[PDB]
Amino acid sequence: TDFLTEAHLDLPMEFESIGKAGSRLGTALAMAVDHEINMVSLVRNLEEFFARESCGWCTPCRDGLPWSVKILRALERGEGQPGDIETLEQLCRFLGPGKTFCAHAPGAVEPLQSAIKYFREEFEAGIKQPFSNTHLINGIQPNLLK
Amino acid sequence: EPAWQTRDHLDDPVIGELRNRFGPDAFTVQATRTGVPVVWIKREQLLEVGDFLKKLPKPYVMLFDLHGMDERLRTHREGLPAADFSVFYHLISIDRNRDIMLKVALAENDLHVPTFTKLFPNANWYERETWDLFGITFDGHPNLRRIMMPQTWKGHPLRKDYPARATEFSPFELTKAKQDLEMEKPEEWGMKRGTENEDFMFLNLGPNHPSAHGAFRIVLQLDGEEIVDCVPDIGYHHRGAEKMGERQSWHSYIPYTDRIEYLGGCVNEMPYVLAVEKLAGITVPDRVNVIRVMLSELFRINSHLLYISTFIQDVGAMTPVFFAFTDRQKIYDLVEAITGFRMHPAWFRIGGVAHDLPRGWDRLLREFLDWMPKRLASYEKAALQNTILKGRSQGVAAYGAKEALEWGTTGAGLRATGIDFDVRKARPYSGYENFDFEIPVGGGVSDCYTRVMLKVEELRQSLRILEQCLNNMPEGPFKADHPLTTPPPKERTLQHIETLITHFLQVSWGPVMPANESFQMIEATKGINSYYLTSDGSTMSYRTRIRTPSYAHLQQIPAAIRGSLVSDLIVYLGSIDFVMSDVDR
Amino acid sequence: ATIHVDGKEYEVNGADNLLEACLSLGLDIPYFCWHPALGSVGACRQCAVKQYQNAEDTRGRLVMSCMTPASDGTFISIDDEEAKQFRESVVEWLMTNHPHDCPVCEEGGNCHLQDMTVMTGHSFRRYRFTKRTHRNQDLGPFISHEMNRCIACYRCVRYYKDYAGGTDLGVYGAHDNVYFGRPEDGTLESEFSGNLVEICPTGVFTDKTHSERYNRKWDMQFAPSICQQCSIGCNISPGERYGELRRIENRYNGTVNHYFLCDRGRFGYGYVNLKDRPRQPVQRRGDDFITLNAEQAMQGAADILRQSKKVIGIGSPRASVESNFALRELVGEENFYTGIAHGEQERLQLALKVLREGGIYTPALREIESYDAVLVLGEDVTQTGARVALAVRQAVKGKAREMAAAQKVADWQIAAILNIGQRAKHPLFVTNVDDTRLDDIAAWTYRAPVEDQARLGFAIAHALDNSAPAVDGIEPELQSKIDVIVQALAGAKKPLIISGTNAGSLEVIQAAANVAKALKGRGADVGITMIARSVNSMGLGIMGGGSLEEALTELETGRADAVVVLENDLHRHASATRVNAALAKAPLVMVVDHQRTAIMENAHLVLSAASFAESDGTVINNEGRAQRFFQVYDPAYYDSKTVMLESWRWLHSLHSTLLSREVDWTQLDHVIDAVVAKIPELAGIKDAAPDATFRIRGQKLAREPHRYSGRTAMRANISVHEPRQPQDIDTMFTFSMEGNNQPTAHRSQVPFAWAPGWNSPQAWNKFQDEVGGKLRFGDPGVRLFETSENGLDYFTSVPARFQPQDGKWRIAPYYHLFGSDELSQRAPVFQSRMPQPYIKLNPADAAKLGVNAGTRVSFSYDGNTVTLPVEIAEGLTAGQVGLPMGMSGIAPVLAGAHLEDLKEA
Ligand code: SF4
Ligand code: SF4
Ligand code: SF4
Ligand code: SF4
Ligand code: FES
Ligand SMILES: [Ca+2]
């Protein structure tokens, strides 16, 4: 389910009440994350659980949850690069209800988009090195993309 | 809106004029990527439409192109009239800076089109070539014979059911054709007065030549030294370039585009890759345009140097050819450093160029730019201001604007008549708007000497373009960021699987151009060159049409030489700036 | 129905899914997990299109086109930006873990994944992390395994388990660590494991036989041909390079063998590339086997035939219609003998009589899949006609398909089909001397001697209709099983009786005919299928002639002093001693053959004939459909001294040289006209394919693709001068690039499938009118005979029970898919897949002789003692002994024969 802030704490636990709040009621067994626990590591652990316990039938969840897990691993170590958060948004948009075979993956990337929406400043702090996907090959001049 | 977008051009004034004249149901407008309004006209109304376009308030004065198309194997013909064959007529209005493409549909049993020579006199060779290569008969043609193949040739080679490869060489055919040469009647060629004045001497000027323009034959009839009739026999340099265009992929055809005008090189590459980029939807970056303009101007300078040296040698001075070939060696040093080859670099690609510029090219460009103008002034003072050369050149084989328009003459010969029509200014391509250069024009008479001086001025303006390019260098990619850029950049091919897959399919099966029709017109070294490409949605061209200016100039050869001398004929041949590969292709 | 694709109106079938409807119209949609034959599961998430609720909708909804039915008035968009972005993203996710393997991968240039990566426009990589790797299993000598290239599209498991009915290929692990293969190292036991090289969109399953001598698809010279390894006649595309046959691809035929071949017909082609084949004519003078060219060989052969008193000709069922007919013209129809034995010819002629005179419609191989009950009498279908066994599996799963269709589930929802159809399946009753490979799905399997199998069929026919002759001596529980079979066959809408000549019993064929007649008399839509042995067995039966025993008696008595053996080794249909003695007595033996056989040592002249890869001709399959196979390559293009002509060409020029004393290398259409003039029952073979003057808008049909490479360098080591392009005067094809292979060409013989952007075997979608249907402009091939109006009568000859006599052992045929067809045993890659020759014994008989399993015992047949190791067969009956038909020393004529002196060695 989606993460919520203190402004959403004063809101009754129903189905329709959480329906327009940008989250789900779920099993109604909430868990509170304090200031000491960084949300980057928490979302990394959540996506690692959702990736290692996915069923692996359909392509977007099966081959995109490891990509998000590796992006969050890079953001944990400060090895983030420009083009990671946008990759997370594109994966979440392409993992919605019916975009995958079932609803396990929309529930998997509900915490990711929630932590993006509410705690984007904690994810941008992991981006430190510029985007270097290729390595220099001696004898071939690279195509300087603009 | 992209410049490569498929357009129907229904807002053009010519479509409205045709609708108001012939009615709204007399023709069918085709939406293509050629950039010109393509109008399918019924066969019976072809002469009426030609006359109506010829008599407009701003008329279509030049027949740019005229050829055929075998449409039997074409599958994607949505919105098109039913045609086994078609004949297309590309007409240009200079006053409007516009052009139209009429298309006549035919049937496999009745391949008979009315002749176009009564409207545009330069249609004679085009219709002879269409009959030779497609079997399309033009009723009313004065002399409809084969022009690329010998008269004893079976079949029409540009048809789809013709084997493109070489047949087996047989010595019996060689002996039979040698017998034809030895026993080679001044009546079958359209000649008249077969020595009726008892002085009408016949000579053969070709086909073998001690000159770099190629091999071709003219049969000269003279009253003493005066030319009374001349029948040029061409096709001694036919290479099946268009039939090869149907047999190579979109990427592996670029070396064949190189050898169309072999003094041009990258200039010949340019309209082909621009037309394929129109088919692919590729908008190349500005650095690619800058690089291609640089190499086109370098090859233009190289070709102009060869032309000026060859003309000066034809007049009789034999030192400037040595000096101009030393300058050509300097240009070849720069081109060898950039591309790796001298004359046929095959360096342009679909969506860019083959490699980036090597580290140090600007030093060679600076050396050439310092070396060139002093040598040009030396050439002028040593040979081009000689009064003997002026007497050999001035007032020799002259024509005005009307004769240049009616024969499709383009380039220096067109602009020597005062018609300020250059493609780099009228229809700017490949970022020629960013360079400050002038277009030299004549006073109204196109002599040999006027054409040579205009080519000298064009060389000077190309040097100015090179200086402006060396001063201002943009930085960026040498290839486009399009999925259809062929081939992809090499390092990403060597270390990325998607790029490797795209490279693997593009260099083996070929890039797949979606089914459309494209047309690119550029200013060549020798005039106006154009590539007209039809894709059937495959990895090879369904049709490759190459319009070259030397074809029109050699068609204008008999019209401006009647009543002149044989030495005047040699000077005229030397002052056209033609090659036989351009004519025959 | 009516669909709106990007504003354009299209008319499609309402029962079809949207992906197959859009692919049928020529629209390009990327897809991996969907196959026309395997149904749909929606794994790869690649076929996304944006569907709109009404005519004026902006947002739409992204939907999967392989799940979306093509209902009336369905508004969709393919080329809008959202759907293209999603499909590019799916391709990008597939490309994250894909190895950098395209240069060293056998699927390069033939890869569905490459085509769909290029089609989606995805060429820029932004993935910088590690890629998962997998260890490679060993799948045997046919299929090479490489699991790094997998995209987890689940087509292999779907085909191999649901379609092919295999048991040793599965998916393991979870998430992105899914592994497709066997639980351990071993050979893939399915007889249709070779179709994985076309079902798999990637390079996980590759042809190992092709991988040994590999070339790309653009370099291959293809021709449309018919597989020569059994009587089914599956259409194939043999492709060659540098003068050797390289690959056998599946050629789509919507009537016979649409997407699938069997392993024998895909990997048994290696006999063509054998180096012991005759390449030039050889004459034996004294003991010197000197070498001639064509003209002097024809002249000397014509002379030595001219001063002979009688010339006989022994044809073969391996040879085509034209070659056997040319031999028949050469020797006269009185002196022409078929190369098969008397019993084999009797069974073959009875099967032909049932097919073309029984009044029961024999079904096409595609049409077998739409039958409701199958009774197989005596025929080991998986080992002799394997593709018919695959179609029988499909017909058995038809009950689950019908049960799903009764509960509002379409035929492409194969997951829901298997959910509704848990274990219920159509009745299949197979009967054999032992257990078959159809027993895992068969409703019943009857292991009995062929007399008892025939009696079972006769009892079934009598219980279905009392006019059939009754059987006395049926045990009561066996009678209850007869009643069960009768109740299953009577309730079926379309029953199907399948038999053949491989059982070695005429009575099984008679019993199957009577069951088919009894089911016809009740009003059912019964069909009958008959499996023959060789590629042109039905054609040789239609042509007719004497048996091999008559030819051997003619040679042994001395009435014939000249024998012409056409493509026959003569040991598979008669004993070796008798054939060798007859050929030694004959002073002139002339063998027209393309495989080095044992009778060439006694031969005086050997005419180096051409195989199917180097020859044209017509063959009649087991259903009576005439099919034309074309030459793949010119043998003399690379080796100029090779004189390897067609068998009909050799025999026609020999007849011309014998008559008028000059050589006449004729044209194939002339021989076709001669067949349809002399033989009116073969008059339909003219319509099998158009003649050599057939053109597509003036041009011929290209054998090789547009990007055929190396043409100025492939023969440069022999001479730098390029040779002649080989001229094809026989067919409508050319040995060159310069031809036509357009998918919309008005033609039926397609040499290979290629479309711009579709380099995979999925270009057959472009070459079909609708996907998964027929080939556009009709499937190739024509049935020779129609269904007769009046049928046959009931065969009253009910055989007696099998009584095991002491000292005599009844030989029970145990056919093998790798080892029974002779040319397939010649292939070197089949010598590791074939089993060792084991003689099969009952446990009671093994106890009687006191021999255990694996012991070598010797038996003498025709005065020759041969030893084999014993394998114990529980399913066999007492008094019989199992032998592998077709192997070296064990001729298939031994089936149904007694065996003497069975003792331990
Ligand atoms: S989204 Fe569901 S069906 Fe798809 S792979 Fe993930 S867990 Fe399996
Ligand atoms: S399976 Fe296809 S994409 Fe993968 S390595 Fe082979 S050719 Fe390349
Ligand atoms: S091995 Fe091939 S067929 Fe099987 S899931 Fe992987 S890609 Fe698909
Ligand atoms: S079933 Fe018979 S004809 Fe078909 S591929 Fe197998 S061996 Fe060949
Ligand atoms: S083809 Fe539809 S999701 Fe695979
Ligand atoms: Ca042939």
Q: Which residue of B has its CA nearest to C755?
A: B538
The domains of chain B are located at 13-139, 241-584
| Residue position matching structure tokens 């019943």 | C444
How does strand C880-883 pair with strand C373-377? Answer: unpaired
Please compute, for residue B164, the number of CA atoms within 13 A of its CA located in the half-sphere on the CB side: 18
Q: Where does residue C534 rank: exposed (0-12), middle (13-18), buried (19+ CB within 10 A)?
A: buried
Rounded Cα distance between A35 and C419, Å, is 50
How does strand C179-181 pair with strand C170-172? Answer: antiparallel
How does strand B85-93 pair with strand B62-70? Answer: antiparallel
Quickly name the fold that domain B13-139 has.
Answer: Beta Polymerase; domain 2 (3.30.460)
DSSP-derived secondary structure letter, C68? S
Q: Alpha-carbon Rg of chain C, whole angstroms?
A: 28
The residue type of B543 is: R
Shortest CA distance to B504 belongs to which of C759, C756, C114, C216?
A: C114
CB contact at 8 A, C396 and C374 = yes
List of chain C residues whose C-beta atoms are within 8 Å of the C-beta of residue A67 = 93, 96, 127, 129
Q: Which CATH number belongs to the domain containing residue C897 in this structure?
A: 2.40.40.20
Ligand 2 cavity residues, CB under 6 Å: B 501; C 98-99, 101-102, 105, 107-108, 111, 113-114, 149, 202-203
Rounded Cα distance between A111 and A106, Å, is 9
Rounded Cα distance between B499 and C122, Å, is 8
Question: C43 alpha carbon to ligand 5 midpoint, in Å?
Answer: 6
Cα torsion through C597, C598, C604, C609, rounded to 10: -10
Alpha-helical (H) ranges within B472-541 are 490-495, 497-508
Q: Which residues of A33-52 are buried (b: 16+ CB within 10 A; e: fewer)?
A: eeeeeebbebbbebbbebbe
DSSP-derived secondary structure letter, B33? B
Q: Where does residue B296 rank: exposed (0-12), middle (13-18), buried (19+ CB within 10 A)?
A: buried
Q: Which residues of B331-348 are buried (b: 16+ CB within 10 A; e: fewer)?
A: bbebbeebbeeeebbbbb
C interface test, pick of A57, A88, A100, A137 with most C CB neighbours within 10 Å: A57
For CA atoms A4, A7, A13, A17, give the dihedral sign: negative
Q: How far is CA B297 from the centre of its chain?
A: 17
How does strand B112-114 pair with strand B98-105? Answer: unpaired
Rounded Cα distance between C324 and C329, Å, is 9
Cβ neighbour number for residue C597 with a 10 Å cutoff: 20
CB contact at 8 A, C291 and C281 = yes
Q: Say which CATH class B241-584 falls into.
A: mainly alpha
Domain that holds residue C826: 808-904
Question: C566 alpha carbon to ligand 6 midpoint, in Å?
Answer: 18
Edge-first strand order for the sheet with C8-11 is C8-11, C2-5, C74-77, C48-52, C61-64
Rounded Cα distance between C830 and C263, Å, is 10
CB contact at 8 A, B386 and B393 = no
3-class state of residue C76 by DSSP: strand
CB contact at 8 A, A60 and C96 = no
Q: Which CATH number belongs to the domain containing residue A43 in this structure?
A: 1.20.1440.230
B interface test, pick of C123, C129, C708, C724 with most B CB neighbours within 10 Å: C123
- At C386, which helix (H) or strand (E)? helix C386-405
Please indicate if any CB of chain C lies within 8 Å of the CB of B161. yes
**Directed axis angle between helix A59-76 and helix A39-52, to 10°?**
150
3-class state of residue C620 by DSSP: strand
Rounded Cα distance between C92 and C103, Å, is 20
B11 Cβ contact partners less than 8 Å away, ≥ 6 residues apart = none
User: B482 vs B476, B486, B491, C109, C118, CA distance in Å?
Assistant: 15, 9, 16, 21, 12
The residue type of C885 is: M
DSSP-derived secondary structure letter, C6? T
Please indicate if any CB of chain B lies within 8 Å of the CB of C103. yes
User: C400 vs B469, C395, C411, CA distance in Å?
Assistant: 74, 10, 10
* Cα maximum dimension of chain A: 66
Rounded Cα distance between B447 and B404, Å, is 12
Indicate which atom in ligand 1 lies nearest the CA of residue A54.
Answer: 7
The residue type of C406 is: A
**Directed axis angle between helix A85-93 and helix A104-118, to 10°?**
140
* Cα maximum dimension of chain C: 92
Q: Alpha-carbon Rg of chain A, whole angstroms?
A: 18
- Residue C195: phi, psi to the nearest 5? -75, -10
CA-based nearest distance C293→chain B, Å:
24
**Directed axis angle between helix C342-357 and helix C506-521, to 10°?**
10
Q: How far is CA C518 from the centre of its chain?
A: 31
Experimental method: cryo-EM
C634 Cβ contact partners less than 8 Å away, ≥ 6 residues apart = C614, C726, C735
What does the angle CA C79 – CA C81 – CA C84 come to, to the nearest 5 degrees? 65
Question: C169 alpha carbon to ligand 4 midpoint, in Å?
Answer: 22
DSSP-derived secondary structure letter, A63? H
Rounded Cα distance between C674 and C677, Å, is 5
Rounded Cα distance between B535 and C217, Å, is 23
Domain that holds residue A54: 39-125
The residue type of B506 is: Q
Q: Where does residue C339 rank: exposed (0-12), middle (13-18), buried (19+ CB within 10 A)?
A: buried
Rounded Cα distance between C623 and C532, Å, is 9
**Directed axis angle between helix B320-339 and helix B361-379, to 10°?**
170
3-class state of residue C284 by DSSP: strand
Shortest CA distance to C697 belongs to which of B161, B85, B159?
A: B161
Rounded Cα distance between C624 and C362, Å, is 9
Shortest CA distance to C321 belongs to which of C685, C633, C644, C680?
A: C685
Question: C816 alpha carbon to ligand 6 midpoint, in Å?
Answer: 33
- At C897, which helix (H) or strand (E)? none
CB contact at 8 A, B498 and B487 = no
